[PDB]
Amino acid sequence: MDDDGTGQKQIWRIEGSNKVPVDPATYGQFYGGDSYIILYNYRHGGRQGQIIYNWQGAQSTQDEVAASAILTAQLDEELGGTPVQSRVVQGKEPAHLMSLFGGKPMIIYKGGTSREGGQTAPASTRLFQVRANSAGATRAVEVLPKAGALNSNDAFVLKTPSAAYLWVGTGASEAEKTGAQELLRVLRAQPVQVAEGSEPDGFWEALGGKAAYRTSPRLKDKKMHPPRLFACSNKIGRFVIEEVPGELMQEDLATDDVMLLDTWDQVFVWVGKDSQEEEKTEALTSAKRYIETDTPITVVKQGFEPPSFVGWFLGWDDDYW
């Protein structure tokens, strides 16, 4: 998509069985607990086009998902079936979608709405993980404000009632730092700039006490061979290994299969709760084979992942399973 992403756009949010316009001042910020529809009008190479992006939040319920399907169908027909359709889940946005927000990063908030509870309120202390990919697309995902949630490869934003902090991992990029600043502009707070390893007491205090966090040599590395996740399965009747593209998300770990995470200087073998013994055995063979055709193979179990593994995921959640 050569289009520059500067066309007119309307973003509605799925609320109940309706779509509801989103504050146009906030376009670019989404609730991870919600589903969205983006009608994008553009003109490129002389022709006018239309894209509907159906954005599904990571914590979006099955009924919200069902509601956006009807809602899209309606919108499609209303526009006389002219536009291009694209279904997108959180963390797998194509470049073109990321560009719609004027170079600004996509901000994904904890929480959202539902039929029962309505709009959740934001917490008083909140932490954001700001990660950008190879191409400079940047995502600031809200996570739990604990010391353990940090990782050296990204920049973090911490916002308490009384203070703000911009924590920069040894491995964070300029894109990630710029992104952090934009989030802070949206949060309307002034940062205290903090480098990893020389944090003030107030910073650890705001996160509920200093603790170990997601770090490794590779996580710390500034230069960047970005890590690669593979799904290993034998559900189809024979063992197979396929790569998972886009941002590394907790949902990407198949709870009934084994996963390989190649961080170059280490291969992680993630074992699903509901995986079968054969799946792991084979995976250990395959990993050993990947390596031998050009390194520690660390074996990790669902729910018992070490900080060195989790750090590679954009926004982990201890109570996900």
Determine which residue in the list 256, 265, 278, 318 makes contact with Ca ion, applying CB under 5 A: 256
Give the binding range for Ca ion (CB under 5 A) out of 101-109, 144-152, 234-242, 259-267: 234-242
- Residue 257 near Ca ion by CB under 5 A: yes
256 a known binding residue? yes
Query: Which one of the spans 25-33, 85-93, 139-147, 281-289 is the region binding Ca ion (CB under 5 A)?
Result: 25-33
Nearest to Ca ion of 5, 136 (CB atom): 136
Count residues contacting Ca ion (CB under 5 A)? 10
Q: Which residues contact 228 (CB under 8 A, 6 or more apart)?
A: 243, 260, 261, 262
251 known ligand binder = no
247 is an annotated ligand-binding site residue:
no
Stretch that binds Ca ion, among 39-47, 102-110, 126-134, 206-214 (CB under 5 A): 126-134
166, HSE (Cβ side, Cα atoms, 13 Å): 19
Residue 278 per-residue DSSP state: H
Q: Maximum distance among all alpha carbons in the chain? A: 60
Q: Identify residues after which the chain is interrupted (C–N over 2.5 A).
A: 224, 294
Report 145-164 residues binding Ca ion (CB under 5 A): 153-154
Determine whether the annotation assigns residue 154 to a binding site: yes
- Which residues touch 67 (CB under 8 Å, ≥6 apart)? 14, 16, 17, 18, 35
CB neighbours of 62 closer than 8 A, spacing ≥ 6? none
**Residue 295 beta carbon to Ca ion: minimum distance, rounded to whole angstroms:** 22
282 binds Ca ion per the rule CB under 5 A: no
Q: Of 19, 30, 33, 286, which one interacts with Ca ion (CB under 5 A)?
A: 33
Burial class (CB in 10 A: 0-12, 13-18, 19+), 261: buried
Task: Write the burial class of residue 10 (CB in 10 Å: 0-12 exposed, 13-18 middle, 19+ buried).
Answer: middle
Rounded least distance, CB 157 to Ca ion, Å: 14
Per-residue tokens: 249: 């998300």
Helices (H), the chain: 62-78, 95-99, 174-187, 201-206, 217-220, 277-292, 307-310
Decide: is 227 part of the binding site for Ca ion (CB under 5 A).
no
Closest distance to Ca ion from the beta carbon of 30 (Å): 11
Task: Give yes or no for a contact between 35 and 55, defined as CB atoms under 8 angstroms apart.
Answer: yes
Q: Indicate the residue among 34 and 182 with the shorter CB distance to Ca ion.
A: 34
Which of the stretches 69-77, 112-120, 244-252, 312-320 binds Ca ion when contact is defined by CB under 5 A?
Answer: 112-120
Interface residues for Ca ion in 187-226 (CB under 5 A)?
A: none
**Number of helices and strands (H, E) in the chain?**
7, 17
Task: Please report, as residue ranges, which positions from 296 to 315 form the binding site for Ca ion (by CB under 5 A).
Answer: none
Strand, coil or helix: 187: helix
Spatial CA neighbour of 257 closest among 228, 287, 277: 277
Q: Which of 32, 91, 111, 112 binds Ca ion (CB under 5 A)?
A: 112
Q: How far is the CB of 236 from Ca ion (least distance, A)?
A: 10
SS3 content of the chain, % helix, strand, coil (to 5): 20, 30, 45
CB of 122 to Ca ion, least distance (A): 15
Secondary structure letter of residue 42 according to DSSP = E
Q: Taking CB under 5 A as the rule, does residue 34 contact Ca ion?
A: yes
| 298 among annotated binding-site residues | no
117 among annotated binding-site residues: no
* 83 marked ligand binding residue: yes
Q: Is 174 in the site for Ca ion (CB under 5 A)?
A: no
Q: Which residues bind Ca ion (CB under 5 A)?
A: 33-34, 112, 114, 131, 153-154, 235, 256-257
Residue ranges at the known binding site for Ca(2+): 33-34, 64, 76, 81, 83, 113, 153-154, 176, 256-257, 279
